[PDB]
Every structure is written in structure tokens, then in C-alpha cells.
Amino acid sequence: MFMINILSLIIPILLAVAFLTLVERKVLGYMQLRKGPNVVGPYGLLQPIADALKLFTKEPLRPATSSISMFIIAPILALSLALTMWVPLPMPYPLINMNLGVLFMLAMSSLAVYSILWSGWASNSKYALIGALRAVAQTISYEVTLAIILLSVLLMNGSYTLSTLITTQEHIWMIFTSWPLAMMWFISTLAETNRAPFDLTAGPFAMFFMAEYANIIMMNAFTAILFLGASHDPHTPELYTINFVLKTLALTITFLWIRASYPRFRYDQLMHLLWKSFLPLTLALCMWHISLPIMTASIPPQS
Amino acid sequence: PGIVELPTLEDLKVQEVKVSSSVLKAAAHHYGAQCDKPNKEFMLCRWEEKDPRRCLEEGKLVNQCALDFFRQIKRHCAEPFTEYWTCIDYSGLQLFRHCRKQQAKFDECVLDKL
Amino acid sequence: MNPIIYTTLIMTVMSGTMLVMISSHWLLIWIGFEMNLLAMIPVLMKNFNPRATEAATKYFLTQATASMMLMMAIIINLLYSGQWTITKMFNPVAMTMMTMALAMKLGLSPFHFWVPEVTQGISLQAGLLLLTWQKLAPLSVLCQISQSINPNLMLTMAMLSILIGGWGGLNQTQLRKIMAYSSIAHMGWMTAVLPYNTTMTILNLLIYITMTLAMFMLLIHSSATTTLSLSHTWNKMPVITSLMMVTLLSMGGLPPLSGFMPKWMIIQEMTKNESIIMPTLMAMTALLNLYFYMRLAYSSSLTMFPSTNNMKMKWQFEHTKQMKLLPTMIVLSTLVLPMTPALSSLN
Amino acid sequence: PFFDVQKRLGLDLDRWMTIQSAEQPHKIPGRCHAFEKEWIECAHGIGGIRAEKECKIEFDDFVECLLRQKTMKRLSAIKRQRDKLIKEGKYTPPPHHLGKEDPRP
Amino acid sequence: MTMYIAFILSTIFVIGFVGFSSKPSPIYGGLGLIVSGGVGCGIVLNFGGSFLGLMVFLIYLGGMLVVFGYTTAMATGDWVIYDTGDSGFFSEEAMGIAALYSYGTWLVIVTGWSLLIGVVVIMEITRGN
Amino acid sequence: MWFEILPGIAVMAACLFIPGMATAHIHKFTNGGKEKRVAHFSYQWNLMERDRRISGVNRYHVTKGLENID
Amino acid sequence: MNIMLTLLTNVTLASLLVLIAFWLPQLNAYSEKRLPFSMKFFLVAITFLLFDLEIALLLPLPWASQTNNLKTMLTMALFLLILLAASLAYEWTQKGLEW
Amino acid sequence: MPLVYMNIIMAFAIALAGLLMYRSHLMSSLLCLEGMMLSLFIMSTLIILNTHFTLANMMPIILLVFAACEAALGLSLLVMVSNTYGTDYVQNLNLLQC
Amino acid sequence: GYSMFAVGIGTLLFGYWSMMKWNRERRRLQIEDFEARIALMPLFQAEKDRRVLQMLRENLEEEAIIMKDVPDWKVGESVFHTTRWVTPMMGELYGLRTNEEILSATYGFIWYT
Amino acid sequence: AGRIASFLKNAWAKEPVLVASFAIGGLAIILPSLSPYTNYAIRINRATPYNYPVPLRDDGNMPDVPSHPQDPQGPSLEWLKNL
Ligand SMILES: CCCCCCCCCCCCCCCCC[C@@H](O)O[C@H](CO[C@H](O)CCCCCCCCCCCCCCC)COP(=O)(O)OCC[N+](C)(C)C
Numbered sequence A: 001m002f003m004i005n006i007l008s009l010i011i012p013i014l015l016a017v018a019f020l021t022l023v024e025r026k027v028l029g030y031m032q033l034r035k036g037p038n039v040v041g042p043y044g045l046l047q048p049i050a051d052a053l054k055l056f057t058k059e060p061l062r063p064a065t066s067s068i069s070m071f072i073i074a075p076i077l078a079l080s081l082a083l084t085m086w087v088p089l090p091m092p093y094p095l096i097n098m099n100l101g102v103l104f105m106l107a108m109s110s111l112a113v114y115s116i117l118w119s120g121w122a123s124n125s126k127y128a129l130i131g132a133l134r135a136v137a138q139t140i141s142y143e144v145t146l147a148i149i150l151l152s153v154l155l156m157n158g159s160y161t162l163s164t165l166i167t168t169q170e171h172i173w174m175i176f177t178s179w180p181l182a183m184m185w186f187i188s189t190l191a192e193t194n195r196a197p198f199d200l201t202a203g204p205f206a207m208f209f210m211a212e213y214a215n216i217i218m219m220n221a222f223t224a225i226l227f228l229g230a231s232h233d234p235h236t237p238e239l240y241t242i243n244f245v246l247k248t249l250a251l252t253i254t255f256l257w258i259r260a261s262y263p264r265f266r267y268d269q270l271m272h273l274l275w276k277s278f279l280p281l282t283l284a285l286c287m288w289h290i291s292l293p294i295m296t297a298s299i300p301p302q303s
Numbered sequence B: 001p002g003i004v005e006l007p008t009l010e011d012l013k014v015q016e017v018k019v020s021s022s023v024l025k026a027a028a029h030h031y032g033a034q035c036d037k038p039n040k041e042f043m044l045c046r047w048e049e050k051d052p053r054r055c056l057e058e059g060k061l062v063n064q065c066a067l068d069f070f071r072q073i074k075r076h077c078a079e080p081f082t083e084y085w086t087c088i089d090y091s092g093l094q095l096f097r098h099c100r101k102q103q104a105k106f107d108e109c110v111l112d113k114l
Numbered sequence C: 001m002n003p004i005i006y007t008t009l010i011m012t013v014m015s016g017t018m019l020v021m022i023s024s025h026w027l028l029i030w031i032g033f034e035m036n037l038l039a040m041i042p043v044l045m046k047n048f049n050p051r052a053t054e055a056a057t058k059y060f061l062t063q064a065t066a067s068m069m070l071m072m073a074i075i076i077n078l079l080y081s082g083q084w085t086i087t088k089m090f091n092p093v094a095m096t097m098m099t100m101a102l103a104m105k106l107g108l109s110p111f112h113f114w115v116p117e118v119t120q121g122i123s124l125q126a127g128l129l130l131l132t133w134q135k136l137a138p139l140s141v142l143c144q145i146s147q148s149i150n151p152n153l154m155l156t157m158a159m160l161s162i163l164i165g166g167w168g169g170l171n172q173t174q175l176r177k178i179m180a181y182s183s184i185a186h187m188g189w190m191t192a193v194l195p196y197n198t199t200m201t202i203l204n205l206l207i208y209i210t211m212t213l214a215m216f217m218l219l220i221h222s223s224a225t226t227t228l229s230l231s232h233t234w235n236k237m238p239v240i241t242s243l244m245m246v247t248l249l250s251m252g253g254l255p256p257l258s259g260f261m262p263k264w265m266i267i268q269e270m271t272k273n274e275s276i277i278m279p280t281l282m283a284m285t286a287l288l289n290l291y292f293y294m295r296l297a298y299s300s301s302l303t304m305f306p307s308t309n310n311m312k313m314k315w316q317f318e319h320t321k322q323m324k325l326l327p328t329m330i331v332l333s334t335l336v337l338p339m340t341p342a343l344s345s346l347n
Numbered sequence D: 001p002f003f004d005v006q007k008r009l010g011l012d013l014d015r016w017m018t019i020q021s022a023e024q025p026h027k028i029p030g031r032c033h034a035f036e037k038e039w040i041e042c043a044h045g046i047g048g049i050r051a052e053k054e055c056k057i058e059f060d061d062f063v064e065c066l067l068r069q070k071t072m073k074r075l076s077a078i079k080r081q082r083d084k085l086i087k088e089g090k091y092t093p094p095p096h097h098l099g100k101e102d103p104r105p
Numbered sequence E: 001m002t003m004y005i006a007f008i009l010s011t012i013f014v015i016g017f018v019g020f021s022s023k024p025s026p027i028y029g030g031l032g033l034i035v036s037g038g039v040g041c042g043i044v045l046n047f048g049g050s051f052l053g054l055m056v057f058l059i060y061l062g063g064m065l066v067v068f069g070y071t072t073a074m075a076t077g078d079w080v081i082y083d084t085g086d087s088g089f090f091s092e093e094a095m096g097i098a099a100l101y102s103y104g105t106w107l108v109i110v111t112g113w114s115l116l117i118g119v120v121v122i123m124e125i126t127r128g129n
Numbered sequence F: 001m002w003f004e005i006l007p008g009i010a011v012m013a014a015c016l017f018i019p020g021m022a023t024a025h026i027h028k029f030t031n032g033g034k035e036k037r038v039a040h041f042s043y044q045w046n047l048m049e050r051d052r053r054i055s056g057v058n059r060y061h062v063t064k065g066l067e068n069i070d
Numbered sequence G: 001m002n003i004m005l006t007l008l009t010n011v012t013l014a015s016l017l018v019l020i021a022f023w024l025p026q027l028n029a030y031s032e033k034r035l036p037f038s039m040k041f042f043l044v045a046i047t048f049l050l051f052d053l054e055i056a057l058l059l060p061l062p063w064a065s066q067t068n069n070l071k072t073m074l075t076m077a078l079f080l081l082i083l084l085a086a087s088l089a090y091e092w093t094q095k096g097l098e099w
Numbered sequence H: 001m002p003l004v005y006m007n008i009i010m011a012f013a014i015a016l017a018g019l020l021m022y023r024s025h026l027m028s029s030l031l032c033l034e035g036m037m038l039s040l041f042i043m044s045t046l047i048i049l050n051t052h053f054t055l056a057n058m059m060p061i062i063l064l065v066f067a068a069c070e071a072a073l074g075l076s077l078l079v080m081v082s083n084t085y086g087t088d089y090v091q092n093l094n095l096l097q098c
Numbered sequence I: 001g002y003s004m005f006a007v008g009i010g011t012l013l014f015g016y017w018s019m020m021k022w023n024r025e026r027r028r029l030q031i032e033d034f035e036a037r038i039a040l041m042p043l044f045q046a047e048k049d050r051r052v053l054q055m056l057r058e059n060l061e062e063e064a065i066i067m068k069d070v071p072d073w074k075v076g077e078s079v080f081h082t083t084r085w086v087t088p089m090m091g092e093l094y095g096l097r098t099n100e101e102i103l104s105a106t107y108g109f110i111w112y113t
Numbered sequence J: 001a002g003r004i005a006s007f008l009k010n011a012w013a014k015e016p017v018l019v020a021s022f023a024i025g026g027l028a029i030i031l032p033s034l035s036p037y038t039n040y041a042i043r044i045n046r047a048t049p050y051n052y053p054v055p056l057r058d059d060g061n062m063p064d065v066p067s068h069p070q071d072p073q074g075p076s077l078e079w080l081k082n083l
């Protein structure tokens, strides 16, 4: 029943982002001394459905001179990549057990910028194209440091297999072994998804929104698996699933908290942040985490 | 140039070890401790001849020795062994480290029996 | 640019060539060519102007295409024999692709079109480096695999190069295009003897490099890039024009000058292989090179052209920078014919 | 041209990566290790011309191992004759080649 | 037999190369090259080259064609030749690639020097003036 | 108060429980009540192939115990 | 097969949802009525390209750590990271990271 | 020699021919070079993986790296040429003539 | 200021020690798994040789039955000059078998996730 | 002495990230050559059996080569158990 497995992996993610919209709106409402939506539905529970119905029946403003090809393609690529990133995730058993799971996710993330580039280029506006170029530059800039931090952390694991991350953290979380890399990784995940304080930018807009929120949840789930390792009992994986979901929810709520707490950067300020604070520390800590298992004779097994 | 020589189908018949990979993994350590000599003779013949057709008798010997090993286990330590390989069969990686207790039971059983 | 950066780039060009000449693995030879290409571009673009940028772009395009063809030939040869060592080609298709790539790197016809373009675009120092040092690596690779080359294709390209250089130099008033076409003709002379004797190829390369170094240094000293500009040199420094005229006589292969040594030897070598017609056509075609060298010699030292009034001011000043190796280059490119048998040193 | 600095200094800058039968990591053999080993041992010191003329048996076996042209020709001939006979109706494949055999470990 | 899936992949690769080799509207040529690169990564991955296929698909597609499109935006028979044995408890491709640090010292030295020189050359070329 | 947020969060929790849990159960159903066998490295693949061959029903997970050794 | 089926399913679901989104509001009738070329962003893209290449060089590190030649691989990995840092420093001091 | 290798070589030849027509858009020339290196990578990887030559698993990576560096240089050159004319048209580089 | 850095360094050191212990244990467990595989290997090698030879024999018998009337055909003629044993390809063993097991033997490991 | 301390103190102000990065990189370069456990890592790597131990054909002239895995002679892994 592989089709059933695919559908039961994909539909719940879309429902989760649908209600993530509500959870974010209500959490920021209560952090702003007010309440979020609590009218449409018993506790706002019907708000995402109302928003979806309103958006799906509204006139689609095709630019009437743009390239229809790229205009259609960009949301397709966005959703396809956002849903594909969830394939190799081991909670605890992955849908598609791969040897180079981390590498596959890195490659998909690298593809993710084509949607931004095509949406900007097919918008038929100079200002929108400038904004798209700025966003693409920020994204590639921060994916450099994501890649380096990721390989440095995986040096403690022995491979690119995502399931082994459960075994690596059977006694202690990876947060304690390397918290500085975790801090820079968290900030880089914030800057990748164009989230505050790095947010400097009817139907297709809804698909773009769904892709972005799916990416947010996916990044937080990957962070939880990578740095906050839940203990997995082979004879009852429900405990691991519960722990993983709880940690993912905590990290997503932390993104909402950060968006509610801080002002935003300038473009040159976040470029300077990356290239002159995160890259040097990332390189130094990469050297440190290369040398540490050799110094301490604690190299992980798999080769 | 030339005709390749192959042994006949009757020449390749042997009493086959029909136990699964979990049973084999559960038995592997004692199997290697007990059946070392025929296995080593076969592997030495195999890297020295560089030819499968020159090593058939040694393979039949290793099959017979494995059958004898499993027959002794069946006569003496059937139930602890069944529990241990049920362990090994459950796990998807077939890890040894998850149920050391049944392994200990099987080890003490074979130590006291054989 | 920063002199330290310029020194680093020059040493990287030289290290790429040396990596090509010391390695036995095709991948390392390709890497040496890549390193040389990478460090060559800023040297050509040192004096920033649109002409130099255009020349650097043309050079990069041609050399990158040649590198891609070289890698293609390497991969085909690996497919038909799991070999990475530079020795035999092991395939007729891999040898043809390899010869094409090395001919494009050298500027042999029919891949000669970029040489006059790039040489005219860049300055005199960049042209000196381009026409002297950049021939060492492809020619070394060709010398290593010469027993594999199809003599028909190599001889066809060599004869084409000689013909094209001779005919294209006849139409030039720019000195840099004259140098480029001379380089093309000399490449043709060098590659026509590879199937028979690589020692003669190396001897021809050494003689050509000496003459080209002397010629470019004389052109830089009397800072002229045009025939009429060179016609003014006698009124300031006639000895430079006299040395230039003797160097041009040597470049034309006239005995008893040094430039007669390669062609002679090459002809000699080719007659040992019952090859008579091709050397004859080669010499008769080199007569064209001699003709346009004589035209330049007429314009430079054998006759005195009109000057300008402002030249008097230039009479009061001396060169601030002088070239240490120019006299040695002139003497070596003019007067080494008596020392010919020293070629047994396998230079 | 070629300046054999590695041979003069005994360095081995790139000789480790030239042939299949030369010290792979974890002693992993090439697919044609034996054929290449035989061809190299045949032609050592003999020189290019004599190796070309006299070691042709080993090189031909090496190329056959590398590209397997002759084996593919033979397999295609056998399968083409099989198809002709099964279309004409005088041959029937056994249950072994139809999926009804008894697989062995 | 999936009608020689390798043959279909190779033919699609050639068709994509023909499509973008006409060079209409260089963004469309780049998109044809993206599809061709995806097909080539599929060929390598289906062959069994997981790491090298992912290297192509990451480096080539996600960096190099991305930079190409960014710059443009500023302006205007099978199944037979294979093996029989296994690879042990590791993958031979990963071992051979990881040997770059123990076996390929010379390769690492020359490649690193070339990359540093490439950075320097890029700065010098784009300095302008 | 703040607990008014909890319902919506709970919904997400359920939506995030479904994939993982589902996979586990499916792995227990298509693999005979056990974990799905992992096969990297090409040796575990050979193990599964041998198990499938000796099973007799062309399923690897059907495990042949010592009762099959005669 | 399974990965191909998963990719096909994701693409198909995305396309189908996009098409229903783009065609449902098109059944009812409605009204139905430059040059500058900044150079800094090009340098950002090129710097990303070069550092991404050096990342590609660094990727086999998890497997490089089981070689029995730990001194050699440690030296070479540290060499690669040092030259990465040196590229960053050179681009920094030549005013290549400025806005 | 299988058909897959011939298909890849014919893709390389098509990319080279495209680089040779030069309709316009030196940008397209760089695209043709990049297609050529993609075909080179694919075919070298297939040959090396087929014969189990473990060490040459290095060289595709190497090739990749070097080619991309070249591309970067090429792109830089393109910009400067465009920086002179405002467009990357091939026919604009007619100042120097044989 | 000093206290924050002290806490960070201390938690780093605790994590380092814990990971040292756990990874040494993982190395020992991996060695034990490898030991078991080594112990089992000779039987697998014997079965491999027997199966390959049996499949080759079936192919040879079917070739003899098929090519009985081909004039110049020799049954079971080697393509190599050398008499040394050569490992057969995938297509030599499964050439005459059905398509599904050809796909299995070619792509089962690659396509298994 | 005074100048170097002044320079380091001036860098620790307004440039703490660079100071930390350079310190960590230098420690990564230096410490492995001084740690006593790097040789232990080398030994652990050499003790991992990836390949089948091919037996030697005995000739009566190898006292140090065991006939059985249980025999005392041959490399031991007690040190690894101790770690
Ligand atoms: C003798 C000539 C020196 C002066 C001329 C220099 C010419 C150019 C500079 C580059 C040459 C440097 C020599 C290094 C050659 C590499 C091979 C040699 O060093 O042996 C290596 C030894 O490795 C050493 O660690 C070398 C480390 C030195 C590299 C770090 C600095 C390199 C900088 C050199 C110039 C690069 C650009 C400038 C940088 C500032 C191989 O390791 P080994 O384990 O035995 O064998 C592996 C095979 N196994 C697996 C079967 C065992």
C-alpha cells in the first residue's frame, strides 16, 4: 500500500499548515495582549476552512501580458519541493529510507530558488524582478552556511542517513555536543524561509503560502531530528512520534515568538551578518568538529 | 576460442541450509567458532584456485558441517535459540544489542549442554 | 593591478604549464591546462580597455572549447582502454579529437582565426607572453603522443597553417597581426616534423621563441604598434632599427642567420623519409613571410621616412626601463648557425 | 616535453590513479583486474612497438572484458535464433526460464 | 523489462540538448538545460551512482544554472553489461570518492590552489576601472 | 486566556501524528508483523534475496526456523 | 520505482490543485476588464558559486574519517578549510563584501 | 559499445555544434559549454562506475569543480563585455577584424 | 560574562565525554556485527558459486537445444583466448530468463527504499 | 609583549567573533598533534574488519599465525574493550 502511505503522509501535512495559519495568528494575538480569531468556528477552528473557500473562489489576476508557462510552473515547483522534502524524514520510520537522505534534502532545498526566480522574471515588472533578485541572493547566501553547518554536525553521525541520527542521540541530545552550530543553524533556517527578522519581501498565492508554511514546519522538524534526538523504542514507535511532533510544534511556536519579538534587518545588514559573522565561525567550528573525533578517539562507526 | 567446461546439474546438488538470515545471524558467532576448519579450507581453496569449479567439494563440506551444527543446536538448545532468533528477526537492522537477555540465555544453554 | 597579484598570476600560469609537462596522468594534464587558462585571463586584461576585454573573451571561449574537446578525447580513450597514462591513444576517434583540441590550443589552421584577433586586442607584453609561453604545454603533449597521430591530418594542418600565415601576413599594416601570422606559420613548420622527429620540433620552438622575444622586446623599446609608427624610429634610435632589420632577416630564414637553422634541419629530416614535395611547397610558401618581412625592413631601416617636429623633444630623454635579456636574445636569434650540431643535446 | 620529476625523486604524484590493478582502497578489485594485470605484465619493459605487436592476445582479452562486444553479439545471436524458433513453433522454453523453477539459496 | 528505461532517459537527454541547442530566448535554453540536467541526474542515479548523481543535481542545477539564470535576469542493450557480485557492507563509490583525502593529496593541492586563484582572478576581472 | 490557543495546536498535533504512525503500521502490515528490513550496502540486499528464495512463497519476511533443517 | 511514484504523486497533486484553483473562479463571468544592472549582486552570486564548489569538495568528509591515514586526511581537510577561509579573507580585504 | 554512450556523445556533438553556430547571445555560448561538460560528467561517471575503478570516482567531482570555476570566469567576462555595450550580442564584437 | 562562557564550555565538555563513550560503544557493536558477517561469509560464497554454475549449466543446455541447426555454431564456445575463469555478466546468467527477474537482478537493490 | 596584549584586547572589543573564530581554528590545527588519543583512533580504524580475513596456507613456519580464532596468538582487541 505505497499509494496509501504517500497520501497519508501528504494530506496531513497540508492540514497541518492550514491550522498552522490559525495557530500563528492566535499566538501572536495573545502575545499582543489580545485574542486571535475566535468567532468563525468554536474557537476559530473554522477560520482556515473559511479562508480556503474565500481564496479558491476569488478571481485570479493573471497579469494579461506575462508568460503563462512560468506563471503556472512556479507554484507547481514550490508545492512539489515542499511535499518532497517530507519523504526522507524518519518519524521514526521514513517513507523512503535513503542512504544519502541529508544530501537529497540539500539538493531539493537548492532547487527551491527556481520558483522565486521564475515568479520574479514572469511578473513583468522591474521592481518585482529586483525584489526577486534580492531574495535569491539572500537565499543562496544562507544555504552556503546551512550546508557547512550540516556537514559539520553530521561528522558526529558517521553518514548522511537520517535514521542514524536517532542512534547517535540515544543517550544525549546533539544540542549539548554543539550548541553554537545549533544557534547559527536556527538563525540560518529563519533567514532561509524569509521569516522575520529576515522578511524583506488568489489561487497561486494560496499555493505559494502553503509551500512556504510547509517549508517552515519541515525545517523545524529537521531541526528537531538533528539536534533534539528522541529516544526510539523499536516495539512502540508511537512514543517517538509523539516526542518528535511535540518538539516540532515547540520549534514552530518559537518561530512565531521570534516573529512577534523583534524588528527586521536591512538587506546589507543581514548580508554582513552572514558573510562576516556566521561564515568565519562556521569555518572555524567545521575545523573543530573535523578534528575533535580524531583528538578524542570518538569517530562514529559507519563507513 | 575453446569450450568452457561446466559441472553437470547433478554435480551441483547438496543438502541445502534452509534457515533464514535471522537464524543465521543469531547462530553466526558459535557457528564460526565451531565450523572454522571446513570454512577456512574452502576460503583458502577459493582465493588460491580463483575458480568456482575447483572448489565444489569444499563447499559441500561446509554445507554438511553447517547442517551438523544446526542439528546439534536443534537437539540441545531449541527453545532459547528460537527466542533469540525471534529477537533478531523482529528488528529491521537485525541488531544484536536490543535483547542481550535471550542471547545470554542461549549462550548459557549451549555452554552447559555442548 | 597589484604587483604581488601580477607575480602570483604569472607564477600560476607557469605552474600550470609545468604541471602539464611533469605529469603522467591525463586528468593532471587537463588540470594544468585549466590552471593556465584561469591565470592567463587577467594578464591579457591587465591594461583595462574594451579591446583587451574582447580579446580575453575570445581567448577564453576558444581555450575552454579546446579543453572540453580534450576531456572528451580523454574519456573516449578511457572507454576503449581503461588507461589514464599519457602514452598511446588506443582509438582512432580519440586521437582525432585530441589532435583537434591541441591544434585549437596552439592556433593551427583551421583553428587559427583567434590568434590575430587576440594578439591585436592585447598589449605588447601580453602578446609576448601569449605567443611565447603558451605554446610549451600543447607542444609537449603533442611530442608525447606523436607516435599516435595520423600523419595525414597533422601534415594537412601544418601545410594549411604555413599557407595561411604566409597569405595573411601579406595584408597587414599592424605589427601585432604580423606577429600573429608569423606565429601561425611557425606553428605549421613545427607540427610538420612531429611525426618524424620531435627533436626538430623542440629546436624549431626554441629558435622561434628566441626570435619572437627579441622582436617583441624591440617593439616595446621603440613603442610602436603600427608600420608608420615604426617608420619614425630611425630619427631617435637608428641602432634599434638596424637590429630590428637584422632580426627580420633572421626571421625570414635567410642564411647565414639563425632562423635558417630550423627549416633547413626540418627539410633535411623530411627528406630522410622520402618526403620531397611537401618540404618544397613549405619553402616556397615561406617566401611570402620573407616578402612581408622585407617590406617591414624597407619601412624601418633601409629607407628614412618623414618625421615630425615634436620628435626633437624626445631626443632629450632616455628610457627609464631597460631590458636585460634583449642583447642576448638578439645575438642568439642572429648568430648561432655555426653551433647547429649542438641540437644533439636533445634541447 | 615530459620531465619525469616523479621518477627522479620517487614521489608518486599521480601514478596511483593510472591503472585498475593498483592498490584500490579496501582492496576492492576492478571488474577487469586480471586481464589488465596480464596485459601489463606481458608488455613491461618490452616497449610500445613490440608490446603492440606481441601482446595482442592479452590486450584483446582486456578489451573484450572492458566492452564485452563479442559476448553481446553471441547473446543476441542466441536470442534471435530462439525468437525465430519460438515464432515458428518448434521450441518451448523450460519452466526454469519461465519463472516456475525452484530457487536455490 | 521496463522497455530499456536507460534508452528512454538517454533519448530524452538528447532531445533536451537539441531543444536548447537551438538557443531560443536564452531563459528557455536554460530551462531546457535544467530539464536535461535532471534527466542526466536520473541516468546516473538509475545506474547506481547515488552520490555522484546527487552532486550533479546539487552543484550543477542548484548553484551553476541558478547563477546563470540570475545573471541572465539582470540583463534583458542495457541490463547486460552489469556485475554479479556484491560490494560488502559499504558502497564502493563512497569509498572511492572519500579516498580523495588519503590518496588524492596532489589532486586536493592543485584543486585548492586553482579555486583560490579563481577567486583572485574573478576579483581582478570584475574590478573594472 | 492563553489556553484558548490549545485547541488549534492540538489539531496540528493530530495532523502531525498521522504520517509517522501510519508508516509504522503499514510497515507492520506489508512486512509480516515486523519492522521493514533495511538494506543499504548490498549485503543486506543479498540477505533479503536469499530469504525470499528459501521462503517458498516469494516473500522474504516469511522466516524459516530450525524446523526446516531436518 | 517508489521514489518515482512519490515524485509523480507530488507533482500531480500540486498541478491538479493549481488547475482547480485557476479554473474554479473562471466559470462565473466577471468584468474581465531596468538598465542599471547592479554589480554587487553579480559578485554575491559568483561568491556563492565558488564557495558552493568548495563545499562540493568538502562533502566526502563523513566517509574520509575511516582511512587509517588519519594524519594525512586531517591535514588535507584542514588545508581545504584554510584555503576556504583564505578566499573569504581575500574577498573581504579587497572590498568585495561591501554594499 | 552500447547505445547509451553513443547517445551521450551525440548530445556532446549537438552542444558543440550549438556553440559553433553563434546565432547571438554569448550567454548561449556559455550554456553550450555547460551542456558539453554535463555530458562529459555523465559519460565519465557511467564508464567509471561500470568498470568498478574505485579511485576514478574522484575525477567527475574534480571535473565538475573545475568546469564550474571556468563558468564563473566566463560569466564575469560576459558582464564586462555587456558593460561596454548594454547587451551580450555576439555581433557586437566586430571591432577587431582579421 | 565569565559565568556564561563557563556554563557553555562545561556543557560542551559533558557532551563531548558522553559522545566519546557512546561512539566507542558503537564502534565495538559494529565490529561485532562485522564478525558475524565474516563468520557467515563462506556458506554464502559456496551457495553463490553453486547457483551461478547451475544457472550457467541451464543456459548451456538450452543453447545446445536451440542452436542445433545453426551451421557454424559451436555450443559453449568461449569468447576469450585465455582458459582462465571469467566472471559472467548479468546478461550471461539472466539472458534467457523472464523479464521480471531480469529487472529484479538489475535494479532491485537500486530501487529498494 | 605590551603591544601584542594591547592588540588582542583591542580585537576582543568590537571584533569578538573574529577572535573566537581564529582561536577555535588554531586550536583545531594544534590540538590533534598533542592529544594521546589520535593513535587510539588510528588503531580503532585499523581494527574494523570490512573484508574477509583470507587464511594463509600453512607451511609449518608460522608460530605467530593461529590455526583457530580461539588460539592465543594473533592481534587482540582487549584494549578496545577497555576504552
Ligand atoms: C620536493 C619539492 C618541494 C618544492 C616544490 C613545490 C612544487 C609545488 C608545491 C606543491 C608540492 C608539495 C609536495 C606535496 C606532494 C603530495 C604527495 C606527498 O606529499 O605525499 C603525501 C603525504 O601527505 C602529506 O600530508 C602532504 C601534506 C602537505 C600539503 C599541505 C600544504 C601544501 C601546499 C603546497 C603548495 C600549494 C599552494 C600554496 C599553499 C600556500 C601522500 O600521503 P601518504 O600518506 O604518504 O600516501 C597516501 C597513499 N596511501 C594511502 C597508500 C598511504
Ligand SMILES: CCCCCCCC/C=C\CCCCCCCC(=O)O[C@H](COC(=O)CCCCCCC/C=C/CCCCCCCC)COP(=O)(O)OCCN
Pocket: A180, A182, A183, A184, A185, A186, A187, A197, A223, A227, A258, A262, A273, A277, A278, A281, A288, I009, I012, J014, J015, J017, J020, J024
Ligand atoms: C574548549 C573548547 C571549546 C571550543 C570553542 C567554542 C567556544 C564558542 C564561543 C563562541 C560561540 C558563539 C557563536 C554563536 C553565534 C554568534 C554570531 C554573532 O554573534 O553574530 C552577531 C549577530 O547576531 C544576531 O544579530 C542574530 C539575531 C537574529 C534574531 C534572532 C533572535 C535571537 C533569539 C532566538 C533564539 C535562538 C535559539 C538558538 C538555539 C536554536 C536551537 C535549534 C553579531 O552581530 P552584531 O552584534 O550586530 O555585530 C556585528 C558588527 N561587528
Ligand SMILES: CCCCCCCC/C=C\CCCCCCCC(=O)O[C@H](COC(=O)CCCCCCC/C=C/CCCCCCCC)COP(=O)(O)OCCN
Pocket: A276, A279, A280, A281, A283, A284, G082, G085, G086, G088, G089, G092, G093, J011, J015, J018, J019, J020, J021, J022, J023, J024, J025, J026, J029
Ligand atoms: C590560523 C587559523 C586559521 C583558521 C581559523 C579561522 C577560520 C575562519 C576565520 C577566518 C575568516 C576570514 C577572516 C578575514 C579577516 C578580515 C579582517 C578585516 O579586515 O575586517 C576588519 C574587522 O576586524 C578587524 O579589525 C581586522 C582583524 C582584527 C583582528 C581579528 C583577530 C585576529 C586574531 C585574534 C585571535 C588570535 C589567536 C587566538 C587567541 C584568542 C585569545 C585566547 C574590518 O572590518 P570591516 O568589515 O571591513 O568594516 C570596515 C568599517 N570598520
